[PDB]
């Protein structure tokens, strides 16, 4: 009771933090709620993802800015940019480690419904991908293996259990194709996946309700624009 009341209050404060654009708070609230051991609803999964996407998103944006200035200073004087980029990088790795720990300890299960299973495995691939963006050597190669494994396991489930227009399936395919292009240096595989995903969803669009149609075509436009970008 004190435990369940504690969980519902943490969820409610996460929703309040979202409204206040207090995303670090929101992530802290949702982490607390996840450790209570109860499955997250569709809504609550989105709260978790919104919170951490905003937090890591700001770190990634900062890392790219600092990395770019660092590389410009290293082209053809002062340790400051390197020192500060390294700090942001370590902090980014720590947030990714936290999300990955939550996924493995509490959220990823063989038992769930397909949508939740794919959601969390996609998230696992995403946050290994963000680690890969900042890694460099054999570390990077091993992180890349880990992201591909998570993405591919999610892809297997989505192709077995969801229709080709399902928005979670489409978003997984979008991100796994970006992984191929930008991370794994496999541009032909990225184009193939994105084109196949778009084409197989296009063939089913006529079957969708108005709300489903809106959700699916939004992600399909992203697939189409990436294909335009890459071809």
């Amino acid at each position: 009771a004190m435990g369940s009341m504690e969980r519902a209050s943490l969820i409610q404060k996460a929703k309040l933090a979202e409204q206040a654009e207090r995303y670090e708070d929101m992530a802290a609230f949702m982490k607390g709620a996840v450790e209570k051991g109860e499955e997250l609803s569709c809504e609550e999964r989105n709260l978790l993802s919104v919170a951490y996407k905003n937090v890591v998103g700001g770190q990634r944006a900062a890392w790219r800015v600092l990395s770019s200035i660092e590389q410009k200073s290293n082209e053809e004087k002062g340790p400051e940019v390197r020192e500060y980029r390294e700090k942001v990088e370590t902090e980014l790795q720590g947030v990714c480690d936290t999300v990955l720990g939550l996924l493995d300890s509490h959220l990823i299960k063989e038992a769930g419904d397909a949508e939740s299973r794919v959601f969390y495995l996609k998230m696992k691939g995403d946050y290994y991908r963000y680690l890969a963006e900042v890694a460099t050597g054999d570390d990077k190669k091993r992180i890349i293996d880990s992201a591909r494994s998570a993405y591919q396991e999610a892809m297997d489930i989505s192709k077995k259990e969801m229709p080709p227009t399902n928005p979670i399936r489409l978003g997984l395919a979008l991100n796994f194709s970006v992984f191929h292009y930008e991370i794994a240096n496999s541009p032909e595989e990225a184009i193939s996946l994105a084109k196949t995903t778009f084409d197989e969803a296009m063939a089913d669009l006529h079957t969708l309700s108005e709300d489903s149609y809106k959700d699916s075509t939004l992600i399909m436009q992203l697939l189409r624009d990436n294909l335009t970008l890459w071809t």
């Binding site: 995403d126 991100n175 624009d225 970008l229 890459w230």
Partner: peptide, 11 residues
């Protein structure tokens, strides 16, 4: 070059 789109949830 611009970066490719990724997606985790609708805006």
């Amino acid at each position: 070059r611009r970066r490719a789109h990724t997606f985790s949830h609708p805006p």
